[PDB]
PDB file of all heavy atoms in Angstrom:
ATOM      1  N   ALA A  10      75.977 142.304 224.790  1.00 14.16           N
ATOM      2  CA  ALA A  10      76.397 140.904 224.955  1.00 14.16           C
ATOM      3  C   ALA A  10      75.564 139.966 224.173  1.00 14.16           C
ATOM      4  O   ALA A  10      74.567 140.337 223.557  1.00 14.16           O
ATOM      5  CB  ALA A  10      76.330 140.649 226.469  1.00 14.16           C
ATOM      6  N   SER A  11      76.068 138.656 224.130  1.00 17.13           N
ATOM      7  CA  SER A  11      75.365 137.610 223.261  1.00 17.13           C
ATOM      8  C   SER A  11      74.091 137.104 223.893  1.00 17.13           C
ATOM      9  O   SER A  11      74.009 136.810 225.161  1.00 17.13           O
ATOM     10  CB  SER A  11      76.303 136.403 223.049  1.00 17.13           C
ATOM     11  OG  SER A  11      77.669 136.879 222.898  1.00 17.13           O
ATOM     12  N   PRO A  12      73.001 136.847 223.087  1.00 15.65           N
ATOM     13  CA  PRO A  12      71.780 136.218 223.580  1.00 15.65           C
ATOM     14  C   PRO A  12      71.922 134.771 224.121  1.00 15.65           C
ATOM     15  O   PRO A  12      72.967 134.231 223.976  1.00 15.65           O
ATOM     16  CB  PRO A  12      70.724 136.321 222.462  1.00 15.65           C
ATOM     17  CG  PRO A  12      71.299 137.379 221.592  1.00 15.65           C
ATOM     18  CD  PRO A  12      72.798 137.264 221.666  1.00 15.65           C
ATOM     19  N   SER A  13      70.865 134.237 224.651  1.00 15.16           N
ATOM     20  CA  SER A  13      70.787 132.805 224.846  1.00 15.16           C
ATOM     21  C   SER A  13      69.308 132.332 224.494  1.00 15.16           C
ATOM     22  O   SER A  13      68.416 133.171 224.683  1.00 15.16           O
ATOM     23  CB  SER A  13      71.096 132.355 226.339  1.00 15.16           C
ATOM     24  OG  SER A  13      70.252 132.998 227.303  1.00 15.16           O
ATOM     25  N   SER A  14      69.111 131.111 224.159  1.00 13.77           N
ATOM     26  CA  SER A  14      67.792 130.612 223.838  1.00 13.77           C
ATOM     27  C   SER A  14      66.963 130.300 224.967  1.00 13.77           C
ATOM     28  O   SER A  14      67.465 130.239 226.074  1.00 13.77           O
ATOM     29  CB  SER A  14      67.928 129.346 222.898  1.00 13.77           C
ATOM     30  OG  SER A  14      66.768 129.062 222.172  1.00 13.77           O
ATOM     31  N   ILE A  15      65.673 130.180 224.825  1.00 15.95           N
ATOM     32  CA  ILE A  15      64.726 129.883 225.910  1.00 15.95           C
ATOM     33  C   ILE A  15      65.076 128.565 226.599  1.00 15.95           C
ATOM     34  O   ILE A  15      65.060 128.451 227.816  1.00 15.95           O
ATOM     35  CB  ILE A  15      63.227 129.932 225.522  1.00 15.95           C
ATOM     36  CG1 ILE A  15      62.925 131.184 224.693  1.00 15.95           C
ATOM     37  CG2 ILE A  15      62.399 129.999 226.841  1.00 15.95           C
ATOM     38  CD1 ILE A  15      61.459 131.340 224.333  1.00 15.95           C
ATOM     39  N   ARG A  16      65.484 127.587 225.797  1.00 20.19           N
ATOM     40  CA  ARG A  16      65.893 126.255 226.276  1.00 20.19           C
ATOM     41  C   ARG A  16      67.124 126.297 227.175  1.00 20.19           C
ATOM     42  O   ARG A  16      67.366 125.376 227.905  1.00 20.19           O
ATOM     43  CB  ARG A  16      66.174 125.373 224.959  1.00 20.19           C
ATOM     44  CG  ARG A  16      66.709 123.986 225.217  1.00 20.19           C
ATOM     45  CD  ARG A  16      66.852 123.245 223.820  1.00 20.19           C
ATOM     46  NE  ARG A  16      65.570 122.584 223.433  1.00 20.19           N
ATOM     47  CZ  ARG A  16      64.552 123.098 222.796  1.00 20.19           C
ATOM     48  NH1 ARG A  16      64.631 124.358 222.337  1.00 20.19           N
ATOM     49  NH2 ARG A  16      63.478 122.300 222.656  1.00 20.19           N
ATOM     50  N   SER A  17      67.812 127.396 227.162  1.00 19.68           N
ATOM     51  CA  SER A  17      69.083 127.516 227.949  1.00 19.68           C
ATOM     52  C   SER A  17      68.767 127.945 229.444  1.00 19.68           C
ATOM     53  O   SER A  17      69.617 127.922 230.256  1.00 19.68           O
ATOM     54  CB  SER A  17      69.996 128.567 227.387  1.00 19.68           C
ATOM     55  OG  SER A  17      70.306 128.209 226.050  1.00 19.68           O
ATOM     56  N   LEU A  18      67.570 128.294 229.770  1.00 15.99           N
ATOM     57  CA  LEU A  18      67.132 128.773 231.061  1.00 15.99           C
ATOM     58  C   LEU A  18      67.141 127.686 232.123  1.00 15.99           C
ATOM     59  O   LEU A  18      66.076 127.072 232.378  1.00 15.99           O
ATOM     60  CB  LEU A  18      65.831 129.514 231.002  1.00 15.99           C
ATOM     61  CG  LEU A  18      65.781 130.838 230.163  1.00 15.99           C
ATOM     62  CD1 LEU A  18      64.331 131.272 229.903  1.00 15.99           C
ATOM     63  CD2 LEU A  18      66.628 131.915 230.792  1.00 15.99           C
ATOM     64  N   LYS A  19      68.208 127.362 232.677  1.00 14.94           N
ATOM     65  CA  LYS A  19      68.298 126.552 233.945  1.00 14.94           C
ATOM     66  C   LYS A  19      67.546 127.280 235.009  1.00 14.94           C
ATOM     67  O   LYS A  19      67.664 128.500 235.077  1.00 14.94           O
ATOM     68  CB  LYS A  19      69.724 126.243 234.349  1.00 14.94           C
ATOM     69  CG  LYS A  19      70.481 125.254 233.327  1.00 14.94           C
ATOM     70  CD  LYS A  19      71.862 124.904 233.829  1.00 14.94           C
ATOM     71  CE  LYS A  19      72.513 123.978 232.913  1.00 14.94           C
ATOM     72  NZ  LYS A  19      73.795 123.420 233.372  1.00 14.94           N
ATOM     73  N   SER A  20      66.937 126.543 235.906  1.00 15.41           N
ATOM     74  CA  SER A  20      66.225 127.137 237.039  1.00 15.41           C
ATOM     75  C   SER A  20      67.100 127.784 238.033  1.00 15.41           C
ATOM     76  O   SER A  20      66.625 128.325 239.123  1.00 15.41           O
ATOM     77  CB  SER A  20      65.243 126.106 237.637  1.00 15.41           C
ATOM     78  OG  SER A  20      64.243 125.752 236.699  1.00 15.41           O
ATOM     79  N   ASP A  21      68.470 127.729 237.922  1.00 13.56           N
ATOM     80  CA  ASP A  21      69.334 128.476 238.672  1.00 13.56           C
ATOM     81  C   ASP A  21      69.215 129.921 238.432  1.00 13.56           C
ATOM     82  O   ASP A  21      69.654 130.692 239.264  1.00 13.56           O
ATOM     83  CB  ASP A  21      70.780 127.967 238.372  1.00 13.56           C
ATOM     84  CG  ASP A  21      71.866 128.617 239.224  1.00 13.56           C
ATOM     85  OD1 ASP A  21      71.617 128.713 240.474  1.00 13.56           O
ATOM     86  OD2 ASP A  21      72.937 128.957 238.771  1.00 13.56           O
ATOM     87  N   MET A  22      68.663 130.366 237.310  1.00 11.28           N
ATOM     88  CA  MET A  22      68.506 131.697 236.954  1.00 11.28           C
ATOM     89  C   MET A  22      67.300 132.474 237.525  1.00 11.28           C
ATOM     90  O   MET A  22      66.995 133.639 237.035  1.00 11.28           O
ATOM     91  CB  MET A  22      68.266 131.817 235.354  1.00 11.28           C
ATOM     92  CG  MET A  22      69.552 131.175 234.539  1.00 11.28           C
ATOM     93  SD  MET A  22      71.072 132.204 234.813  1.00 11.28           S
ATOM     94  CE  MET A  22      70.701 133.713 234.073  1.00 11.28           C
ATOM     95  N   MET A  23      66.643 131.976 238.498  1.00 11.42           N
ATOM     96  CA  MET A  23      65.482 132.708 239.142  1.00 11.42           C
ATOM     97  C   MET A  23      65.943 134.046 239.824  1.00 11.42           C
ATOM     98  O   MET A  23      66.801 134.094 240.545  1.00 11.42           O
ATOM     99  CB  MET A  23      64.833 131.842 240.206  1.00 11.42           C
ATOM    100  CG  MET A  23      64.064 130.691 239.564  1.00 11.42           C
ATOM    101  SD  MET A  23      62.675 131.193 238.589  1.00 11.42           S
ATOM    102  CE  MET A  23      62.212 129.653 237.757  1.00 11.42           C
ATOM    103  N   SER A  24      65.228 135.132 239.303  1.00 13.23           N
ATOM    104  CA  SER A  24      65.496 136.570 239.657  1.00 13.23           C
ATOM    105  C   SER A  24      66.791 137.197 239.033  1.00 13.23           C
ATOM    106  O   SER A  24      67.032 138.300 239.161  1.00 13.23           O
ATOM    107  CB  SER A  24      65.561 136.709 241.191  1.00 13.23           C
ATOM    108  OG  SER A  24      66.759 136.397 241.703  1.00 13.23           O
ATOM    109  N   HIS A  25      67.573 136.409 238.276  1.00 13.44           N
ATOM    110  CA  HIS A  25      68.728 136.937 237.592  1.00 13.44           C
ATOM    111  C   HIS A  25      68.244 137.693 236.291  1.00 13.44           C
ATOM    112  O   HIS A  25      67.243 137.359 235.679  1.00 13.44           O
ATOM    113  CB  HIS A  25      69.754 135.822 237.295  1.00 13.44           C
ATOM    114  CG  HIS A  25      70.400 135.334 238.559  1.00 13.44           C
ATOM    115  ND1 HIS A  25      71.475 135.844 239.105  1.00 13.44           N
ATOM    116  CD2 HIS A  25      70.095 134.209 239.321  1.00 13.44           C
ATOM    117  CE1 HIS A  25      71.851 135.229 240.214  1.00 13.44           C
ATOM    118  NE2 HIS A  25      70.995 134.047 240.295  1.00 13.44           N
ATOM    119  N   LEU A  26      69.097 138.606 235.811  1.00 12.10           N
ATOM    120  CA  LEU A  26      68.810 139.359 234.599  1.00 12.10           C
ATOM    121  C   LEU A  26      69.263 138.547 233.388  1.00 12.10           C
ATOM    122  O   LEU A  26      70.307 137.943 233.326  1.00 12.10           O
ATOM    123  CB  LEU A  26      69.542 140.651 234.708  1.00 12.10           C
ATOM    124  CG  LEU A  26      69.270 141.685 233.541  1.00 12.10           C
ATOM    125  CD1 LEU A  26      67.908 142.381 233.728  1.00 12.10           C
ATOM    126  CD2 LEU A  26      70.412 142.748 233.482  1.00 12.10           C
ATOM    127  N   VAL A  27      68.352 138.464 232.406  1.00 12.09           N
ATOM    128  CA  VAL A  27      68.543 137.664 231.206  1.00 12.09           C
ATOM    129  C   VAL A  27      68.206 138.402 229.901  1.00 12.09           C
ATOM    130  O   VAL A  27      67.401 139.306 229.934  1.00 12.09           O
ATOM    131  CB  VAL A  27      67.749 136.277 231.296  1.00 12.09           C
ATOM    132  CG1 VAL A  27      67.957 135.539 232.564  1.00 12.09           C
ATOM    133  CG2 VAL A  27      66.132 136.466 231.061  1.00 12.09           C
ATOM    134  N   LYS A  28      68.839 137.917 228.846  1.00 11.12           N
ATOM    135  CA  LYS A  28      68.618 138.367 227.457  1.00 11.12           C
ATOM    136  C   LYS A  28      68.203 137.317 226.573  1.00 11.12           C
ATOM    137  O   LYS A  28      68.946 136.359 226.421  1.00 11.12           O
ATOM    138  CB  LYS A  28      69.883 139.115 226.938  1.00 11.12           C
ATOM    139  CG  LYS A  28      69.719 139.821 225.570  1.00 11.12           C
ATOM    140  CD  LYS A  28      70.980 140.559 225.152  1.00 11.12           C
ATOM    141  CE  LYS A  28      70.835 141.137 223.779  1.00 11.12           C
ATOM    142  NZ  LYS A  28      72.069 141.802 223.232  1.00 11.12           N
ATOM    143  N   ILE A  29      67.075 137.456 225.871  1.00 10.76           N
ATOM    144  CA  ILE A  29      66.413 136.334 225.134  1.00 10.76           C
ATOM    145  C   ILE A  29      66.024 136.907 223.722  1.00 10.76           C
ATOM    146  O   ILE A  29      65.418 137.938 223.715  1.00 10.76           O
ATOM    147  CB  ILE A  29      65.334 135.716 225.939  1.00 10.76           C
ATOM    148  CG1 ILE A  29      65.810 134.920 227.029  1.00 10.76           C
ATOM    149  CG2 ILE A  29      64.313 134.889 224.974  1.00 10.76           C
ATOM    150  CD1 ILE A  29      64.872 134.729 228.187  1.00 10.76           C
ATOM    151  N   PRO A  30      66.218 136.074 222.591  1.00 12.14           N
ATOM    152  CA  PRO A  30      65.577 136.479 221.293  1.00 12.14           C
ATOM    153  C   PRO A  30      64.302 135.652 220.970  1.00 12.14           C
ATOM    154  O   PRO A  30      64.151 134.609 221.612  1.00 12.14           O
ATOM    155  CB  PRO A  30      66.664 136.135 220.368  1.00 12.14           C
ATOM    156  CG  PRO A  30      67.320 134.936 220.927  1.00 12.14           C
ATOM    157  CD  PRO A  30      67.128 134.969 222.373  1.00 12.14           C
ATOM    158  N   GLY A  31      63.455 136.069 220.068  1.00 12.46           N
ATOM    159  CA  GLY A  31      62.283 135.294 219.717  1.00 12.46           C
ATOM    160  C   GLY A  31      61.272 136.021 218.858  1.00 12.46           C
ATOM    161  O   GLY A  31      61.655 137.125 218.383  1.00 12.46           O
ATOM    162  N   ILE A  32      60.137 135.433 218.722  1.00 14.28           N
ATOM    163  CA  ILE A  32      59.006 135.905 217.997  1.00 14.28           C
ATOM    164  C   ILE A  32      57.822 136.147 218.884  1.00 14.28           C
ATOM    165  O   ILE A  32      57.533 135.269 219.717  1.00 14.28           O
ATOM    166  CB  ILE A  32      58.583 134.991 216.797  1.00 14.28           C
ATOM    167  CG1 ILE A  32      59.776 134.701 215.880  1.00 14.28           C
ATOM    168  CG2 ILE A  32      57.478 135.672 215.921  1.00 14.28           C
ATOM    169  CD1 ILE A  32      60.393 133.311 216.144  1.00 14.28           C
ATOM    170  N   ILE A  33      57.166 137.296 218.783  1.00 15.18           N
ATOM    171  CA  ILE A  33      55.930 137.622 219.556  1.00 15.18           C
ATOM    172  C   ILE A  33      54.772 136.895 218.825  1.00 15.18           C
ATOM    173  O   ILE A  33      54.579 137.104 217.565  1.00 15.18           O
ATOM    174  CB  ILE A  33      55.695 139.110 219.621  1.00 15.18           C
ATOM    175  CG1 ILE A  33      56.804 139.825 220.279  1.00 15.18           C
ATOM    176  CG2 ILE A  33      54.330 139.380 220.318  1.00 15.18           C
ATOM    177  CD1 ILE A  33      57.082 139.483 221.808  1.00 15.18           C
ATOM    178  N   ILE A  34      54.004 136.003 219.483  1.00 14.68           N
ATOM    179  CA  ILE A  34      52.969 135.273 218.959  1.00 14.68           C
ATOM    180  C   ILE A  34      51.547 135.696 219.534  1.00 14.68           C
ATOM    181  O   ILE A  34      50.517 135.193 218.969  1.00 14.68           O
ATOM    182  CB  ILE A  34      53.156 133.703 219.022  1.00 14.68           C
ATOM    183  CG1 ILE A  34      53.292 133.191 220.488  1.00 14.68           C
ATOM    184  CG2 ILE A  34      54.387 133.341 218.139  1.00 14.68           C
ATOM    185  CD1 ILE A  34      53.231 131.726 220.604  1.00 14.68           C
ATOM    186  N   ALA A  35      51.493 136.381 220.601  1.00 14.61           N
ATOM    187  CA  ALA A  35      50.174 136.768 221.114  1.00 14.61           C
ATOM    188  C   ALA A  35      50.299 138.100 221.925  1.00 14.61           C
ATOM    189  O   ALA A  35      51.404 138.369 222.554  1.00 14.61           O
ATOM    190  CB  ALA A  35      49.566 135.757 222.045  1.00 14.61           C
ATOM    191  N   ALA A  36      49.328 139.003 221.911  1.00 15.07           N
ATOM    192  CA  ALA A  36      49.397 140.317 222.499  1.00 15.07           C
ATOM    193  C   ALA A  36      48.018 140.768 223.034  1.00 15.07           C
ATOM    194  O   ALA A  36      47.054 140.776 222.235  1.00 15.07           O
ATOM    195  CB  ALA A  36      49.977 141.370 221.466  1.00 15.07           C
ATOM    196  N   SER A  37      47.981 141.138 224.304  1.00 13.83           N
ATOM    197  CA  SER A  37      46.775 141.610 224.957  1.00 13.83           C
ATOM    198  C   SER A  37      46.474 143.104 224.597  1.00 13.83           C
ATOM    199  O   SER A  37      47.412 143.807 224.207  1.00 13.83           O
ATOM    200  CB  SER A  37      46.877 141.422 226.450  1.00 13.83           C
ATOM    201  OG  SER A  37      45.793 142.010 227.118  1.00 13.83           O
ATOM    202  N   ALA A  38      45.223 143.481 224.846  1.00 14.44           N
ATOM    203  CA  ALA A  38      44.842 144.873 224.840  1.00 14.44           C
ATOM    204  C   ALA A  38      45.257 145.507 226.159  1.00 14.44           C
ATOM    205  O   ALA A  38      45.576 144.878 227.119  1.00 14.44           O
ATOM    206  CB  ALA A  38      43.291 145.017 224.581  1.00 14.44           C
ATOM    207  N   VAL A  39      45.259 146.808 226.188  1.00 15.11           N
ATOM    208  CA  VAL A  39      45.832 147.600 227.334  1.00 15.11           C
ATOM    209  C   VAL A  39      44.858 147.583 228.496  1.00 15.11           C
ATOM    210  O   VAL A  39      43.601 147.536 228.305  1.00 15.11           O
ATOM    211  CB  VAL A  39      46.155 149.021 226.858  1.00 15.11           C
ATOM    212  CG1 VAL A  39      46.690 149.923 228.092  1.00 15.11           C
ATOM    213  CG2 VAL A  39      47.198 149.043 225.764  1.00 15.11           C
ATOM    214  N   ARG A  40      45.431 147.653 229.776  1.00 11.21           N
ATOM    215  CA  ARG A  40      44.604 147.667 230.971  1.00 11.21           C
ATOM    216  C   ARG A  40      45.290 148.737 231.944  1.00 11.21           C
ATOM    217  O   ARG A  40      46.368 149.215 231.631  1.00 11.21           O
ATOM    218  CB  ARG A  40      44.615 146.350 231.715  1.00 11.21           C
ATOM    219  CG  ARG A  40      44.084 145.157 230.874  1.00 11.21           C
ATOM    220  CD  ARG A  40      43.955 143.945 231.817  1.00 11.21           C
ATOM    221  NE  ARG A  40      43.668 142.652 231.064  1.00 11.21           N
ATOM    222  CZ  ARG A  40      44.509 141.887 230.553  1.00 11.21           C
ATOM    223  NH1 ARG A  40      45.815 142.113 230.580  1.00 11.21           N
ATOM    224  NH2 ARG A  40      44.102 140.826 229.815  1.00 11.21           N
ATOM    225  N   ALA A  41      44.619 148.993 233.019  1.00 14.43           N
ATOM    226  CA  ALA A  41      45.122 149.881 234.042  1.00 14.43           C
ATOM    227  C   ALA A  41      45.450 149.197 235.304  1.00 14.43           C
ATOM    228  O   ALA A  41      44.734 148.254 235.760  1.00 14.43           O
ATOM    229  CB  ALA A  41      44.011 150.926 234.396  1.00 14.43           C
ATOM    230  N   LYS A  42      46.635 149.437 235.932  1.00 12.93           N
ATOM    231  CA  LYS A  42      47.247 148.767 237.048  1.00 12.93           C
ATOM    232  C   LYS A  42      47.629 149.805 238.074  1.00 12.93           C
ATOM    233  O   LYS A  42      48.217 150.796 237.757  1.00 12.93           O
ATOM    234  CB  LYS A  42      48.459 147.925 236.539  1.00 12.93           C
ATOM    235  CG  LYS A  42      49.114 147.202 237.670  1.00 12.93           C
ATOM    236  CD  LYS A  42      50.313 146.333 237.139  1.00 12.93           C
ATOM    237  CE  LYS A  42      51.036 145.540 238.199  1.00 12.93           C
ATOM    238  NZ  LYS A  42      50.181 144.381 238.690  1.00 12.93           N
ATOM    239  N   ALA A  43      47.272 149.461 239.323  1.00 13.83           N
ATOM    240  CA  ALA A  43      47.504 150.349 240.495  1.00 13.83           C
ATOM    241  C   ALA A  43      48.990 150.391 240.859  1.00 13.83           C
ATOM    242  O   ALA A  43      49.586 149.290 240.920  1.00 13.83           O
ATOM    243  CB  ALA A  43      46.638 149.963 241.636  1.00 13.83           C
TER     244      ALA A  43
END
């Protein structure tokens, strides 16, 4: 299906499944989670 931009995210979408395009600008190192 077709994407939508971040600006399209109305707050009606809380907990709904979404598809978004973009550029990664920051990335953390790995951690351990319980």
Side-chain angles (χ1 to χ4, degrees):
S11 321
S13 63
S14 197
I15 314 187
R16 175 177 274 85
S17 309
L18 294 170
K19 291 186 177 184
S20 297
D21 189 42
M22 299 298 291
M23 289 294 167
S24 78
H25 293 272
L26 186 74
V27 308
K28 184 177 175 183
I29 286 154
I32 306 103
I33 301 295
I34 59 165
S37 179
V39 176
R40 304 187 189 88
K42 183 179 179 70

